[PDB]
Amino acid sequence: SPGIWQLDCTHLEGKVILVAVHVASGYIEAEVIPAETGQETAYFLLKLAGRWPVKTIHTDNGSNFTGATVRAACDWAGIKQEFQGVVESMNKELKKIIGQVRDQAEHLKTAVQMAVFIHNKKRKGYSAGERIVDIIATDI
Amino acid sequence: SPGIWQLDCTHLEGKVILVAVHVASGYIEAEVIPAETGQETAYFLLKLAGRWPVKTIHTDNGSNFTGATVRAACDWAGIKQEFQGVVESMNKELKKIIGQVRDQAEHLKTAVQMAVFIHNKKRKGYSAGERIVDIIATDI
Amino acid sequence: WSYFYDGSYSYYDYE
Amino acid sequence: WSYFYDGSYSYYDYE
């Protein structure tokens, strides 16, 4: 579980948002991508894998997660792919936060990263951003 | 020191690369940005701050790190700015790794993230990617 | 703003 | 490839 991630692709304002959820912590990373292609998903995954121990990703079967460029990035980074309502829980939570801050950002992409911040930093002892590093740190 | 970062702006293949170095661990994040503007630096910083406890950034005095959009992002995220050869040590190390993998990537941007990966994952006990989360986890 | 189940959205905050 | 101190670069690996 220290290295299991859920990745999903959702749409806001007629744009594409890539969402990665570290299932065990609820930590989120997200980005607005130019297009729903394997190329952009491979880039995102490569960045994700250089930050965190990414061992397995669960995605749906869209052409952007099964394409050739995604398969190669996962081979190179050493990530096994597989093809829950955890995704939907997070997409809804993220959309709600984006809606609440959107007026403070010239562009969607900025609002997305504001919402990711707000999500990862909020406490209830241990935010999701604190939980992910504690999970990993413990795994060493 | 758990939250001190060095940010620099360097050039490869006639493009602009933003580099963030977590000084205490040597952990690196980097991205190829469309232009050397405050807007793109503010986006990068916002993403950085939603992942890690970013408390202080040290930059040079270029117009991309002092502009109005950067100042606002740091206010919003709660980051103090300040204006070593740690930057040069990392830019040289990163360029060397990028040079060695560039042929395996269609585009510079991919090679950059391959080099960041290689850098953060390499051991000597505790890679820089393991060191950063252990530093932070300990700080909780 | 409000983002709906379908891809559409509104500038108005209904919730 | 080789990336030099100035912004220039070469496709050749000199080191």
Numbering used by the authors:
A (entry chain A), B (entry chain A): 57 to 139, 148 to 188, 193 to 208
C (entry chain B), D (entry chain B): 1 to 15
Task: Please give sentences taken from the publication describing this entry.
Multimerization of IN is functionally imperative and provides a forthcoming therapeutic target. Allosteric inhibitors of IN bind to non-catalytic sites and prevent correct multimerization not only restricting viral integration but also the assembly and maturation of viral particles. Within a functional IN tetramer, the NTD and CTD of one dimer wrap around an extended α-helix (α4) of CCD of a second dimer ([Fig fig1]), an interdomain-docking platform that is functionally imperative. Here, we report an allosteric inhibitor peptide targeting an unexploited SH3-docking platform of retroviral IN.
We derived a peptide (WSYFYDGSYSYYDYESY) mostly representing the CDR3 sequence (underlined) with the addition of Trp (for UV-Vis absorbance) and Ser-Tyr (representing CDR2 extension in wrapping around α4). To characterize the peptide binding site(s), we solved the 2.0 Å crystal structure of HIV-1 IN CCD in complex with the peptide ([Table tbl1]). Except for the C-terminal pair of residues (Ser-Tyr), well-defined electron densities show binding of the peptide molecule to two sites, which we call site-1 and site-2 ([Fig fig2]). Site-1 is at the tetrameic interface and is formed by a CTD from a flanking protomer docking at the carboxyl-terminus of CCD α4 of an inner protomer ([Fig fig2] & [Fig fig1]). Forming site-2 is the docking of a CTD of another flanking protomer into the amino-terminus of the same α4 ([Fig fig2]). The surface area buried upon peptide binding at site-2 is ~ 100 Å^2^ larger than that at site-1 (744 as compared to 650 Å^2^). Peptide binding at site-2 also involves a higher number of interacting residues at the interface (26 as compared to 17 at site-1). Side chains of two residues of the peptide (Trp1 and Tyr3 at site-1 and Ser10 and Tyr14 at site-2) participate in direct hydrogen bonds with the CCD (to side chains of Glu69 and Asp167 at site-1, and to carbonyl oxygen of Val79 and Ala80 at site-2). Superimposing the CCD-peptide structure onto that of the HIV-1 intasome reveals potential steric interference with the CCD docking platform of CTD but not NTD at site-1 ([Fig fig2], top). Therefore, peptide binding at either of these sites, or both, would inhibit CTD interactions with CCD, and can rationalize the observed inhibition of IN multimerization ([Fig fig1]) and strand-transfer activity ([Fig fig1]).
